[PDB]
Structure 1
Amino acid sequence: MSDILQELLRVSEKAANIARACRQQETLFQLDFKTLAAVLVQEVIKENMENKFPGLGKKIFGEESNELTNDLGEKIIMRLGPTEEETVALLSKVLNGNKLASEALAKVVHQDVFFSDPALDSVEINIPQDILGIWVDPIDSTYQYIKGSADITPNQGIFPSGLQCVTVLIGVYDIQTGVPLMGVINQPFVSQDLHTRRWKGQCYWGLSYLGTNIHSLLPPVSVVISTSEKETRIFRAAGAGYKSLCVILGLADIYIFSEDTTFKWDSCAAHAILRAMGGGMVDLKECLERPQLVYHVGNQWANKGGLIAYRSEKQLETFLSRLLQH
């Protein structure tokens, strides 16, 4: 429902805050750290949603485990809190007792966020909690996150690489039918002030429930196609979330992926937002033999057969016609 969606936006901003903190504070920029940040962000999302909506916390699935393996080989189960002290203790257990890295992490983990949207505040939609499943990618395009390029110049509005390709993806789907219902995409690194080195982000939301379709306000902007960097008119770009975003905003009309290296958490949130706009994601191999992606049944959680992401079915039929006449 709209309430759950507002909470998801809030925790998306907290996740973006953790992601930015790990690269803009010197002690965190010091420092496997990428999976540490990913597992931490996923756990922050999960625990916030469980605390605000009891019973939801078990329904939140993601790319990361909640277990980590420190330098000694100890398995540590990630449970934060109940407040900052035990979080600093747990982080000192994972980070070999580096006290100020632990303290900075717990400081931005437990820091309250009051990020809202007046558009979604008046929307009053209720959805029974028992039917909701959640796929979460805490940090999409991890290689661009660690690479940290800030100076990349886009091509026709599309960044081929850089921190702009990093996203936090939170998708909600129907447990029984497998249809995506709700979507949040957080872009933590959209704009950087050259003189303060501070990054401004963006967030996009969508909802598609029983014939009702709402979405966040989009900025104003033959076919334009986005492909990934290792895919084997047409632009290359990093990030599954980011390419779906290019389709959402209209920077591109089709996003094709022919490999089987995406998963439900890569595509769920974006699929829901696209669905709220008349678009969707279809199974690529299924269309070529002549079928929307579902999120309740696995194979394991990979989107086997690749995908096409589209905002307008007009463009999809045009493209498939021209495509398989060769």
Structure 2
Amino acid sequence: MSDILQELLRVSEKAANIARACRQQETLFQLDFKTLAAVLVQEVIKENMENKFPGLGKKIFGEESNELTNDLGEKIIMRLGPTEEETVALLSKVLNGNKLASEALAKVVHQDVFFSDPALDSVEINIPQDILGIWVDPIDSTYQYIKGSADITPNQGIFPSGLQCVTVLIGVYDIQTGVPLMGVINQPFVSQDLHTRRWKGQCYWGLSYLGTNIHSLLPPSVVISTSEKETRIFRAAGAGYKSLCVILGLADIYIFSEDTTFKWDSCAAHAILRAMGGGMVDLKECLERPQLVYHVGNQWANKGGLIAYRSEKQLETFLSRLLQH
């Protein structure tokens, strides 16, 4: 519901703060660190949501595990808190006693965010907690996150690479039907002040529940986004980011032809697209003549690719203009 969604927004901003901290703090910027940061972000989301809505933590699924393997081969279960000191102890057990980085990470983890949307605050929508499942993609496009290019110029507003392609994705779906219900996308690196080097981000949200469709305020023949490895048309890194390009209208269609996207790549974006009248369809099923669902597996890959669209009319146009070859 709207309350769950507001909490999801706040903790998406917390995840954005962690992702920014690991790149703007010298000690963390020195530092498998991508896997640690991803597992950390996902566990932060899960624990915050379970603490605010008890019983929800068991329904939060994600790309990452909650176990890590340190340098010695010990498998460490990632449980944080309740105090900052225990988180420091856990992290130092993962980081070979690196006390500076452990303390910095635990500082960003336990720091709390008060980041609200006044549009969402007036909305009073209630959804039974028992029907909700959650797919988290804690840091999408980890390659662009590690590369760290701050200086890329967009083509027609579409960044082909750069920190702008990194998203945090939180998607809520109906457990019984598989339909996506709510979505949060957090872009942690949208604009960088050249003089202070500090990054500002942007959040986007959407909700489609029993015929009610709301979404965040959007800023003001066919354009198509595809991935880098994919084998008018623009290349862009990031699954969440290309979906966002469709959401914002910078591209009308996003196609992915391989089987290497997953429910956590696409759930949140699908929910926002649904709240605007669009969706995501199975590509292969379209090409032999069907929305994506998120309760049943295969294992959690979107087999047969996907098409993401904001307008059904543009989808029909593109669909049968190409199946004519």
TM-score bucket of the superposed structures, by smaller chain: over 0.9
SS class of match (2:188): strand
Offset, 1:264: 0.0
**Structure 2 residue ranges without an equivalent (≥5):** none
Distance between the aligned counterparts of 2:167 and 2:292, measured in 1? 20
Distance between the aligned counterparts of 2:258 and 2:278, measured in 1? 21
**Cα RMSD between the aligned structures?**
0.2
Offset, 1:70: 0.2
Identity %: 100
SS class of match (1:29): helix
**Structure 1 residue ranges without an equivalent (≥5):** none
SS class of match (2:230): coil
Distance between the aligned counterparts of 2:86 and 2:175, measured in 1? 34
Offset, 1:282: 0.1
SS class of match (1:39): helix
Q: Provide Cα deviations, 1:149-184, integer angstroms capped at 9, x if missing partner.
A: 000000000000000000000000000000000000
Q: Provide Cα deviations, 1:253-292, integer angstroms capped at 9, x if missing partner.
A: 0000000000000000000000000000000000000000
Distance between the aligned counterparts of 1:165 and 1:323, measured in 2? 28
- Please name the residue that 1:228 is paired with: 227
Q: Provide Cα deviations, 1:190-229, integer angstroms capped at 9, x if missing partner.
A: 0000000000000000000000000000000x00000000
Distance between the aligned counterparts of 2:298 and 2:320, measured in 1? 29
Distance between the aligned counterparts of 1:299 and 1:143, measured in 2? 27
Distance between the aligned counterparts of 1:216 and 1:225, measured in 2? 23
Distance between the aligned counterparts of 1:22 and 1:245, measured in 2? 24
Q: Provide Cα deviations, 1:60-103, integer angstroms capped at 9, x if missing partner.
A: 00000000000000000000000100000000000000001000
Offset, 1:48: 0.1
Distance between the aligned counterparts of 1:114 and 1:154, measured in 2? 31
SS class of match (1:242): helix
Distance between the aligned counterparts of 1:249 and 1:91, measured in 2? 38
SS class of match (2:139): strand
Offset, 1:293: 0.2
- Structure 1 runs of 4+ aligned residues shifted over 2 Å read none
- Please name the residue that 2:321 is paired with: 322
Distance between the aligned counterparts of 1:54 and 1:310, measured in 2? 35
SS class of match (1:135): strand
Distance between the aligned counterparts of 1:288 and 1:232, measured in 2? 16
Distance between the aligned counterparts of 2:161 and 2:29, measured in 1? 20
Distance between the aligned counterparts of 2:134 and 2:112, measured in 1? 23
Offset, 1:299: 0.1
Distance between the aligned counterparts of 1:167 and 1:83, measured in 2? 28
Q: TM-score, normalised by structure 1?
A: 1.00
SS class of match (1:188): strand
